[PDB]
Design a protein around this ligand. Structure first.
Ligand SMILES: [Mg+2]
Ligand SMILES: [Mg+2]
Lengths: 63, 206, 70, 127
RNA sequence: AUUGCUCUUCAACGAGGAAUUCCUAGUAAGCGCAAGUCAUCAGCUUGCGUUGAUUACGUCCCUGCCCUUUGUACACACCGC
RNA sequence: AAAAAUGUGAUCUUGCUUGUAAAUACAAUUUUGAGAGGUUAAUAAAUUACAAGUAGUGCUAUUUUUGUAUUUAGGUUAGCUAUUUAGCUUUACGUU
């Protein structure tokens, strides 16, 4: 299982049609300085770390 | 070392298990380092507490739930269902029993095992229902560390409860079993299965 | 009924053979390895705690956790 | 080195094709469509189906002996839309994923000079 | 059977479908007390304390409501004309 | 099943192409509260049983010993879904 260990630099607004998802810009732990805006479900904060499967796939504001 | 004579006499064992080391209920609280960024800081074994019981003004601001101990959290989770609702002492007892069981099984630190189980249980990516016109399309979304931890905590508890329902296997024992399973990532436990399912779902919607 | 309540000499012997082994002995554990039902299991456990063999960890009502010597 | 094809993605609304051919056009390789891989009537133009079709096409190509393609995209054209469907892009993505190589992408939708009368009537199409 | 107690009878119900209620901290839920009515009757109620969590700490997807801009043959005002 | 031995024109047992003898019982909650008229139409299932035409193989195989047996035991579909080495039901086929 190839897993990517990501890290939160800036929270880029609360998103979704409903409440429970947040847009977050992400500088991943290994191989730094490649920022991706990805969606996070739960309580998020600056300097939080994200475990994820499918890394290089940027998300958008959900309708 | 150094049993000081207080007029109200204390048991010898109790005296021994004090002062020198900042222990848990009986045994040591040290080590247990996760080695998985995300679940460090929000699974807190850094704070050494002696019983899984505090007043705990944790539900107040936002992230103070993080700094609440793991054992306490587990106890709280156990406390679920109206029949058993409140009754924190009982939950604590159950937790203790589980810990004991863990200790008995393959020696090893019980706290560590619990932590491992928790780690195993956190889903990496979960789906959330979007409107998008009308139909029930589900976009896969990454899970925030605290949230993941919470989910893990829930799932194990749920599994334990299920095991209990019409059973000898005393809830504590069931919980212990679940924890063990999680530690040796078997996919025989319930929480683990759920996590797997979630992962599959995420994969499907990506 | 699902059986495992009937009492015998042979059954007793098998139970004995043996207290040694198993990380922990819990009424629950005893049943169902398909042994004598609840009360019987408890009794067996108690017996095992007579002269060594299996020492205790917990002592509570129904949450009775025991483990092999020594 | 690189053995070529022409991909030909007919991406209409309510179905997608992926029709891989030789460079002259005559001799085909695989014609795999959206409705072929998902029996649901509705789910024909639907992305997943399109992707599946693309994958199938790729597989067929591999079986045959081809390495690269030239993407040509066709929206329904003329009397209809002139707007690439939901599952052309999806199909393309699928193709890319497959590893069947890509070179020279075009949209060859037959956009007329001045069409012969369109759908609807004068008052149009009134849901 | 007012209600209580004593023995006896042991029914349905192995966590409940479509639906939908309540809830954000000493809260939720559990637990009993308490007066109210009361000659006698608590499964009710207003309070009380005891035990005491899970999850948000957001959003407009639904629901309602509010405004603004719009359109109006309505003004007993959409159950309108 | 194990074993000693008699005898049959040396011996032994893998199914192929045929037609007849038989086990899917019984029913009720329901069907428009009781009776009558149709298992309408449709339709036999491989399963066991004896013998053919011998590829097989000479078809039929007998007299006596050891144990309560010691023999070799358990379980498979049918559908839906982009949870597709997983999820949900799980013998459908007029309705039960
Ligand atoms: Mg009874
Ligand atoms: Mg009343």
């Amino acid at each position: 299982t190839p897993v990517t260990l990501a890290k939160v630099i800036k929270v880029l607004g609360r998103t979704g049609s409903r409440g429970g998802v947040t847009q977050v810009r992400v500088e991943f732990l290994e191989d730094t300085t490649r920022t991706i805006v990805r969606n996070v479900k739960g309580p998020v904060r600056e300097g939080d770390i994200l475990v994820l499967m499918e890394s290089e796939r940027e998300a958008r504001r959900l309708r | 070392f150094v049993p000081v004579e207080l007029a109200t006499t204390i048991p010898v064992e109790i005296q021994q298990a004090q002062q020198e080391i900042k222990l848990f209920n009986k045994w040591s609280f040290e080590d247990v380092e996760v080695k998985d960024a995300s679940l460090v800081d929000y699974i807190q074994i850094s704070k050494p507490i002696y019983v899984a019981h505090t007043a705990g003004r944790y539900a107040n601001k936002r992230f103070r739930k993080a700094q609440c101990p793991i054992v306490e959290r587990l106890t709280n989770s156990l406390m679920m269902n109206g029949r058993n609702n409140g009754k924190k002492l009982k939950a604590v007892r159950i937790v203790k029993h589980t810990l004991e069981i863990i200790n008995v099984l393959t020696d090893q630190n019980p706290l560590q095992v619990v932590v491992d189980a928790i780690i195993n249980s956190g889903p990496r990516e979960d789906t959330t229902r979007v409107g998008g016109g009308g139909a029930a399309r589900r976009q896969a979304v990454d899970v925030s560390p605290l949230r993941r931890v919470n989910q893990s905590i829930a799932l194990l508890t749920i599994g334990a409860r299920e095991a209990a329902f019409r059973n000898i296997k005393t809830i504590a024992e069931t919980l212990a079993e679940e924890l063990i399973n999680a530690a040796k990532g078997s996919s025989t436990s319930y929480a683990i299965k759920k996590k797997d399912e979630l992962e599959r779902v995420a994969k499907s919607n990506r | 009924a699902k059986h495992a309540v009937v009492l015998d000499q042979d059954k007793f012997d098998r139970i004995m053979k043996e207290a040694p082994t198993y990380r922990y002995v819990s009424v629950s554990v005893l049943v169902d390895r398909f042994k004598l039902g609840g009360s019987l299991a408890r009794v067996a456990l108690r017996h095992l705690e007579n002269e060594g063999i299996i020492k205790p960890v917990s002592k509570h009502s129904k949450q009775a956790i025991y483990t092999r010597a020594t | 080195s690189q053995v070529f094809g022409v991909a030909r993605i007919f991406a209409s609304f309510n179905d997608t094709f992926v029709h891989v051919t030789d460079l002259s056009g005559r001799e085909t390789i695989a014609r795999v469509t959206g409705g072929m891989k998902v029996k649901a009537d509705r789910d024909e133009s639907s992305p997943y189906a399109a992707m599946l079709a693309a994958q199938d096409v790729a597989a067929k190509c591999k079986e045959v002996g081809i390495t690269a393609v030239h993407i040509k995209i066709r929206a329904t054209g003329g009397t209809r839309s002139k707007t690439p469907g939901p599952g052309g892009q999806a199909a393309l993505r699928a193709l890319a994923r497959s590893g069947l190589r890509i070179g020279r992408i075009e949209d060859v939708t037959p956009v007329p000079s001045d069409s012969t009368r369109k759908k609807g009537g004068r008052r149009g199409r009134r849901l």
